[PDB]
Amino acid sequence: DIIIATKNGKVRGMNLTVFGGTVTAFLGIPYAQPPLGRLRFKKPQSLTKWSDIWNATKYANSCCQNIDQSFPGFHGSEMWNPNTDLSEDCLYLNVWIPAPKPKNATVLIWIYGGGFQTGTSSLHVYDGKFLARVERVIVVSMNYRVGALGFLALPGNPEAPGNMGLFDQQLALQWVQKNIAAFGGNPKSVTLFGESAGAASVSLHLLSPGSHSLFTRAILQSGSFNAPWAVTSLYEARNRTLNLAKLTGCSRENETEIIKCLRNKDPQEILLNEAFVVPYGTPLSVNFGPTVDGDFLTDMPDILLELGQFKKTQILVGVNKDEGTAFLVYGAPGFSKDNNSIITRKEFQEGLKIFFPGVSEFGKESILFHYTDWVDDQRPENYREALGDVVGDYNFICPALEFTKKFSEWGNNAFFYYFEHRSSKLPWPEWMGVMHGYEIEFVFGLPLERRDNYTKAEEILSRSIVKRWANFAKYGNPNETQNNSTSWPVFKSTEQKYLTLNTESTRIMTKLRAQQCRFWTSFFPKV
Amino acid sequence: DIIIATKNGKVRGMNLTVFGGTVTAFLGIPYAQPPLGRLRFKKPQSLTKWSDIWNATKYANSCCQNIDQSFPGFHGSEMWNPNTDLSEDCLYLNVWIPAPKPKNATVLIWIYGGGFQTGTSSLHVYDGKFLARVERVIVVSMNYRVGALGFLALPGNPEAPGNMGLFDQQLALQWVQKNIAAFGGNPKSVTLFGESAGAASVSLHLLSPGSHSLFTRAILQSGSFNAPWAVTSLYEARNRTLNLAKLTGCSRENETEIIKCLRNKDPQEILLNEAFVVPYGTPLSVNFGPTVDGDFLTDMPDILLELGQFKKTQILVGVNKDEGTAFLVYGAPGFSKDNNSIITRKEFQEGLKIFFPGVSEFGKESILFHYTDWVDDQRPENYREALGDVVGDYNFICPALEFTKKFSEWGNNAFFYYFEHRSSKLPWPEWMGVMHGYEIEFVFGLPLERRDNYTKAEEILSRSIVKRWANFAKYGNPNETQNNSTSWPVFKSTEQKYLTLNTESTRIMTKLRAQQCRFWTSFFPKV
Ligand SMILES: COc1cc(CNC(=O)Cc2cn(CCCC[C@@H]3C[C@@H]4Cc5nc6cc(Cl)ccc6c(N)c5[C@H](C3)C4)nn2)ccc1O
Ligand SMILES: COc1cc(CNC(=O)Cc2cn(CCCC[C@@H]3C[C@@H]4Cc5nc6cc(Cl)ccc6c(N)c5[C@H](C3)C4)nn2)ccc1O
């Protein structure tokens, strides 16, 4: 029986067998008052004690969110859908502690991705237990609100200010600052790590003054705030709040009662009109994300990092290879999970309009041009791969590079990775390659588990990445220093060195897709 | 005393010492009635005998043309200005014969370049004597009308049909067909070769049915009809004839008397309003060139070669490296023959408007984009070199490639060269590099002459090129088969192999500037 006193009560945990060792987990500790009734759309309110024992013995409820049934019964998509009851009562977190309880352990905090419209800390791929077992860390993860009940914005209005999600994340960070010592954690060795919208969340934490003192280092997987999908400007933010109002019969004259109307609408007629608040969409449409609110983010994030007003510290950021491929089975003509998807050029041109609906007609022809440059017109596959690369480079790769590029030019240590192994177990077709999101099971160390159908090479790939990620957390260098493995250079402007990740050899390279990125970074911003 | 009977009289020549041998030259034989009085703007009329001896002992008059004094006293530009009296009486040609007089020699015919506005067969760099001496060929060269008295067009009107210049060239070809046997020539081994507008002339001979039976093979140096400057469409053709009419006080109602007015204007008030017939110009402005006339060219040349209605035969076509550089000292801001000409980007942007005056504003930004892609922003020279490459690739290189590319796809042997030696004697600044036009002295073999300040390496470069050019004429392969020198591949679509030309080694390469050319060839045609 293991039970530990927080600042607001005492909480009972569970003992887990992990690799012939044990790990303590406390699943579903509450950190913010349930954001219900009067309290939805507002910023999370801190707790009052219980006295009483909170049995942190089950994963709490996932926050309200839509669910992806494009493919019902297909593991490849349902593995990301929540595995808990949905409820606007969801501001809970989970900590995993090594056993015997450590004394001054580094803390790793996970923020899950989901285009800010979906997701939960409860997924099997986010199971922190292997990290605590193997590298004797404390893994923490929290649920933050999502979709419109996380990011609905009327700016300047505390009834619905925008960014209530990131604010949820940060009160979780606050809780770690005050409580983790109880658990044997060190509130001065705290490194965030997320993927996708989570990656974009942790990059936003770097710029938010409110979050400067609640962590030390940062890990960015497949996301950054400067990605085109990540921040919504105040004009669209309002154009989609006031929109959501029209399809829920809430359209009024006085902002301070649109909002009261919207909180008497039951949670779900909110969630299914969320998809329409925008005329044209893409598979990547973040209908309600971060905004510039003058609170969490005090103005346009691209400006403050270009001016360099951010936390100064080491960061670890990378991307996967075929990051664009996942999204083309959700719109693009000729694409299916159930064939090789050999598109013709005309289909490629209509693919581009879904992913760049407007955006001028020419803007598309120059995107087409820069990628159609066949090496050479032979190969039937090449339109197919071209449309994956455009979506991947535009939406993820080039931002990450251009993110870390300028984060280093202010003196900080940055390390960039490129993760090229496709899982032997990936349930998506081979043509999709090394998909967005399928770095994560390796980071969390699911293949270290030997009863699970990963290949032996993948267990050694995972053990390696787990150690680097580990060491970057404690000591700020992604070193694995003893089995003669590749040294990891610092990413600087000019040289721009990145380490690759796969089963075979781990190389050092420069210029991660420089030709492509500089189309997207230097010129497309004008069209 | 050497004197030989043509079909229209007998002509006396001269004996020249060339390299301790002798060569017979007959300079200034007339081949067409003087195109004067009633006869200007019309097609050249064939001769009636003289009986009488025509002493072909001096270079005849150059046809009327403007003269380039941008730089008076500068050898580099005046070496192209005529060296004979100007006169609309100018339809004369020159033949050089080996001694002892050959018996069935190959005939080489030279058509000089000049943007169709200038030029003459009398220049020292076109001195055919070394070719006849060294490789025992017969070199022939003719003067053809130029500027408006060569190419003024009102289409369908035999009083001024257009293309009277190429028609002059072709009656010269006719004369060779009927007379060259007298001189010891073989009217069935006849290969044309020109440079620049001359190159573009000989490519037009390939498409003209009237010229199919007057030659066998073709050499194309630094020009082809598909170049942007080479063919004028019937709308501008008329818009500049009727224009020329307004500035010479000839504007009338009845085409059949605009023309009679224009022939009572003395030759020179024609030539100096030639420059204004167009609102905006460039240094490359061909104010009166070839047109589609339905006689010499029976319709749009790009269509008939794309459909492949041309003479089927081997061709030899190439370009020089810094072909764009010569023209930027005639307009582009920041450029001078008397400094290193390090331009700034803004000057580069105004350079582009002179060379692409309109042409939309964006069209320019995408030209800028595709070339500004510094390797990297370091080097001060790079705007300067960029603007040379745009002019060279647009105007000469990419057309030649795209010309020969499709001439081969119909089964014919094509060989492509890339000439990279800059003359040790070039009077233009080093920054200009391997200039347009400065292949020719090597082809004619001026450095074979040893009293002349070329370097020893240039004499061996010239002897080599003279032999290839030679052998391509007789046997249709640009082979120099005995001193272990590089074999010359055939240029085909797909592989696209070209031989380079310089002092050091002669390499075989593929893909002559493929990235650039395919911007100009595939996409710019739309803007
Ligand atoms: C119409 O009802 C809705 C339904 C949904 C469900 N959403 C989707 O299917 C959107 C989607 C998500 N993905 C990723 C391929 C599968 C791996 C992961 C699945 C996850 C949902 C998601 N969305 C992202 C959006 C952006 Cl811009 C960037 C990354 C995303 C992402 N990583 C993920 C993941 C990983 C979780 N393809 N399409 C969202 C919003 C709705 O309004
Ligand atoms: C205003 O009076 C005029 C004066 C002129 C004199 N023209 C020029 O200076 C035009 C020019 C020509 N050149 C080439 C650099 C020197 C080497 C050669 C000089 C020759 C004139 C000429 N014009 C060409 C135009 C085109 Cl598109 C292509 C090639 C050309 C060319 N090879 C030459 C050469 C080579 C003979 N740079 N600018 C022409 C027309 C006029 O109306």
Round to whole Å and give the CA distance between A192 and B138.
84
Residues facing residue B22 across a β-bridge: B17
**CB of B80 sitting under 6 A from ligand 2:** yes
* Beta strands B138-142; B92-98: pairing state: antiparallel
Helix (H) or strand (E) holding B110: strand B105-111
Instruction: Enumerate the H helices of B162-196 as residue ranges.
Output: 164-179
Distance from CA of A365 to the nearest CA of B (A): 9
Burial B199-210 (b: 16+ CB within 10 A, else e): bbbbbbbbbbeb
B203 is catalytic: no
Q: Which helix (H) or strand (E) holds A268?
A: helix A267-273
How many CB pairs below 8 Å do chains A and B form together?
11
> Among residues B91, B82, B56, B84, which one has the least CA distance to residue B167?
B91
Contact: A523, B373; criterion CB under 8 Å: no
Q: What is the DSSP letter of B274?
A: G
Other CB atoms closer than 10 Å to residue B36's CB: what's the count? 14
* Residue type for position A49: K
Contacts of B518 in chain A (CB under 8 A): 373
- Rounded distance between C-alpha atoms, residue A109 and residue B487, angstroms: 67
Amino acid identity of A452? D
Which residues, at least 6 apart from B482, have a Cβ–Cβ distance to it below 8 Å?
none
> According to the annotation, is B520 in a ligand binding site?
no
- Which residues of chain B have a CB within 8 Å of the CB of A373? 515, 518
Task: Classify burial at A321, counting beta carbons within 10 Å of its beta carbon; exposed 0-12, middle 13-18, buried 19 or more.
Answer: buried
3-state secondary structure of A111: strand
Q: Ligand 1 pocket: which residues have CB below 6 Å?
A: A 66, 68, 80, 113-115, 117-119, 196, 229, 274-275, 283-284, 286, 326-327, 330, 436-437
- Cα–chain center distance at B302: 19
Helix-, strand-, coil-residue percentages of chain A, each rounded to 5:
35, 15, 45
Helix (H) or strand (E) holding A210: none
In the DSSP assignment, the letter for residue A59 is -
- Contact (Cβ atoms closer than 8 angstroms) between residue B400 and residue B222: yes
Chain B residues near residue A523 by CB distance under 8 angstroms: 369
Beta-carbon contacts of residue B370 (< 8 Å; ≥ 6 apart): B516, B519
Whether A369 sits inside 8 A of B523 (CB atoms) is: yes
Q: How far is CA A236 from the centre of its chain?
A: 22
Contact between residue A325 and residue A392 where contact means Cβ atoms under 8 Å apart: yes
CA A129 to chain centroid, in Å, comes to: 20
CA-wise closest residue to A414 among A203, A182, A147: A203
Question: Could you count the other beta carbons within 10 Å of the beta carbon of residue A359?
Answer: 15
Can you tell me whether residue A418 is helix, strand or coil? strand
Mutate-to-test residue for ligand 2 from B110, B120, B195, B196, highest number of ligand atoms within 8 A of CB: B196
Chain A residues close to B523, C-beta within 8 Å = 365, 369
Q: Which residues contact A520 (CB under 8 A, 6 or more apart)?
A: A393, A394, A398
Query: A215 phi and psi, to 5 degrees?
Result: -155, 175
The gap between the terminal CA atoms of chain B, to the nearest Å, is 63
Looking at the DSSP bridge assignments, the partners of residue B322 are B435
CB B226 within 8 A of CB B310: no
Q: Please say if A269 is a catalytic residue.
A: no
**Which two structure tokens, joined as six digits, stand for B515?**
């990235």
From B436, B439, B443, mutation site for ligand 2 pocket: most ligand atoms within 8 A of C-beta: B436
* Cα(B89)–Cα(B62) distance, integer angstroms: 8
The answer to whether the CB atoms of A366 and B362 lie below 8 A apart is no
B355 lines ligand 2 (CB under 6 A): no
The region, left, alpha or beta by phi > 0 then psi within -120 to 50, assigned to residue A321 is alpha
Cis peptide bond N-terminal to A100, omega within 30:
yes
CB count within 10 Å of CB A478 equals 23
As a whole number of Å, the end-to-end CA separation of chain A is 63
Alpha helix locations (H) across B197-276? 197-207, 234-247, 255-264, 267-273
Q: How far apart are CA B401 and CA B392, in angstroms?
A: 13
**Identity of the residue numbered A376:** D
Residue type, A412: N
Task: Count CB-CB contacts under 10 A for residue A30.
Answer: 20
The DSSP string of A343-360 is --HHHHHHHHHHHSSSS-
As given in the structure block, the two tokens for residue A157 are 């209005």
Burial B436-472 (b: 16+ CB within 10 A, else e): bbbbbbbbbbbbbbeeeebeeebbebbbbbbbbbbbb
Tell me the HSE value of B109 on the side-chain side, using a 13 A CA sphere.
31
Q: Which of A366, A373, A518 comes nearest B366 by C-beta?
A: A366
Asked whether the CA dihedral B346, B351, B353, B356 is positive or negative, the reply is: negative
Chain centre distance of CA B165: 13
Structure tokens at A308: 């360099």
Tokens encoding A118 = 């979906």
Buried b / exposed e across A168-199, counting CB within 10 Å, b at 16+? Answer: bbbbbbbbbbebbeebbbbbebbbbbbbbbbb
The Cα A131–Cα A137 span in angstroms is 6
Of B2, B6, B63, which is closest to residue B29 (Cα–Cα)? B6
Q: Tell the residue nearest (CA) to atom 20 of ligand 1.
A: A114
Of the candidates B270, B107, B267, B269, which has an alpha carbon nearest to the alpha carbon of residue B190? B107
With the CA atoms of B78, B79, B82 and B85 taken in that order, what torsion angle do they form, in degrees rounded to the nearest 10? 80
If residue A297 lies in a helix (H) or strand (E), which one and from where to where? none
Distance A286 CA to ligand 1 centre (A): 9
Dist CA B116 CA A414 (whole Å): 61
Q: Is residue A256 a contact partner of residue A157, using CB atoms and an 8 Å limit?
A: yes
Whole-angstrom Cα distance, residue B92 to residue B107? 17
Contact B286, B232 (CB under 8 A): yes
Bridge partners of A62, per DSSP, are: A86
Tokens of A171: 């009160």
Task: Please state how this structure was obtained.
Answer: X-ray
Structure tokens at B185: 């020539």
Q: Out of B88, B195, B323, B458, pick the active-site residue.
A: B323
3-state secondary structure of B12: strand
Question: How remote is the CA of residue A115 from the centroid of ligand 1, in Å?
Answer: 6
What is the C-alpha radius of gyration for chain A, rounded to an integer number of angstroms?
22
Instruction: Name the strand (E) or helix (H) holding A20.
Output: none
The angle at the Cα of B225, spanning B114 to B411, to the nearest 5 degrees, equals 135
Q: What share of chain B is helix, strand, coil (3-state, %, to 5)?
A: 35, 15, 45
Host H or E run for residue A117:
none
For helices A398-408 and A514-522, what crossing angle results, to 10°? 80
Q: CB of A296 within 8 A of CB of A207?
A: no
Q: Report how far residue B12's alpha carbon sits from residue B34's, in angstroms, rounded to the nearest whole number.
A: 20
Integer Cα distance of B8 and B29 in angstroms: 11
Q: A205 is written with which tokens? A: 């934490």
DSSP H or E segment with residue A294: none
Rounded Cα gap, residues A292 and A366, in angstroms: 31
Q: Residue A103: phi, psi to the nearest 5?
A: -115, -35
DSSP secondary structure string for all residues of B383-397:
HHHHHHHHHHIIIII
Nearest chain A residue to B378, by CA: A494
B196 is catalytic: yes
C-alpha span between A424 and A503 (Å, rounded): 11
* Closest residue by CA, ligand 1 atom 36: A114
* Residue B397: CB atoms within 10 Å: 26
Per the structure block, which two tokens stand in for A174? 């606050």
> Tokens 């081997």 map to which residue?
B314
Helices and strands (H, E) in chain A, number of each type: 16, 14
SS3 category, B206: helix
**Bridge-partner residues for B111, per DSSP?**
B194
Angle CA B333–B338–B342, to nearest 5: 50
> Two tokens at A487?
């040294």
For chain B, count helices (H), then strands (E): 16, 14
Per-residue CA distances from A91 to A67, A173, B31, B444 (Å): 19, 12, 99, 87
* Whole-number Å distance between alpha carbons of A277 and A287: 7
Alpha helices in B409-493 (DSSP H): 440-444, 456-475
With residue A50 as reference, give the H or E element that holds it: none
Cis peptide before A376 (omega within 30 of 0): yes
DSSP structure class, residue A90: -
Distance of alpha carbon B336 from the chain centroid: 25
Nearest to A146 by CA among A115, A110, A109, A192: A115
Which resolution, in Å, applies to this structure?
2.9
Residues 367-406 of A with CB under 8 A from B: 369, 373
Angle between helices B361-371 and B382-392 (to 10 degrees): 120
- Residues linked to residue B95 through DSSP beta bridges, in sequence order: B26, B140
Pair A206, A297: CB distance under 8 Å: no
CB A264 within 8 A of CB A239: no
What 8-state DSSP symbol labels residue B115? T
Which residues, in sequence order, are CB contacts of B424 under 8 Å at separation 6+? Answer: B453, B454, B455, B458
Residue B522: how many other CB atoms lie within 10 Å: 13
Q: Which of B368, B403, B412, B415 is nearest to B387 (CA)?
A: B368
**To which H or E segment does residue A194 belong?**
strand A185-195
Return the number of other C-beta atoms located less than 10 Å from residue B340's C-beta.
Answer: 11
Contact between residue A467 and residue A480 where contact means Cβ atoms under 8 Å apart: yes
Q: Is B508 helix (H, G, I), strand (E, B) or coil?
A: strand
* Cβ-contact B144, B34 below 8 angstroms: no
Kindly give, in sequence order, each residue whose CB lies less than 8 Å from that of residue A166, ignoring residues fewer than 6 positions away: A144, A201, A204, A205, A208, A290, A296
Tell me which chain A residues have a C-beta less than 8 angstroms from the C-beta of B515: 373
CA torsion through residues B196, B200, B206, B210, sign:
negative
Pairwise CA distance, residues A207 & A297, whole Å:
7
Cα distances from A149 to residues A45, A278, B155, in angstroms, run 15, 17, 74
Q: Specify burial of residue A259 (Cβ count, 10 A radius: 0-12, 13-18, 19+).
A: buried
* E strand or H helix at A402: helix A398-408
- State the CB neighbour count (10 A cutoff) for residue B70: 10
Which of these, A501, A129, A119, lies nearest to A316 by C-alpha position?
A: A501
Residue type, A73: G
What is d(CA A234, CA A153) in angstroms, rounded to the nearest whole number? 8
Instruction: Check if the beta carbon of residue A203 is closer than 8 Å to that of residue A120.
Output: no
Whole-angstrom distance, CA of residue A103 vs CA of residue A90: 30
Count of CB atoms situated within 10 Å of the CB of B513: 18
Sequence-ordered list of residues with C-beta below 8 angstroms from that of A239, at least 6 positions apart, any chain:
none
Residue B227 has φ and ψ, to the nearest 5°, of -65, 145
Cα B82 to the center of its chain, rounded Å: 15
> Could you give the 3-state DSSP secondary structure of residue A217?
strand
Given a contact cutoff of 8 angstroms between Cβ atoms, the answer to whether A280 and A287 are in contact is: no
- Other Cβ atoms less than 10 A from the Cβ of B385: the count is 17
Q: How many Å lie between the alpha carbon of B228 and the closest alpha carbon of chain A?
A: 22
**Annotated catalytic residue, options B62, B436, B439, B458:** B436
Beta carbons within 8 Å of B407's beta carbon, 6+ residues apart: B206, B305, B310, B315, B414
Q: For residues B466 and B473, give the distance between their C-alpha atoms in angstroms, rounded to a whole number.
A: 11
Interface check B515 vs A, CB under 8 A: yes
Tokens 């999908």 correspond to A229
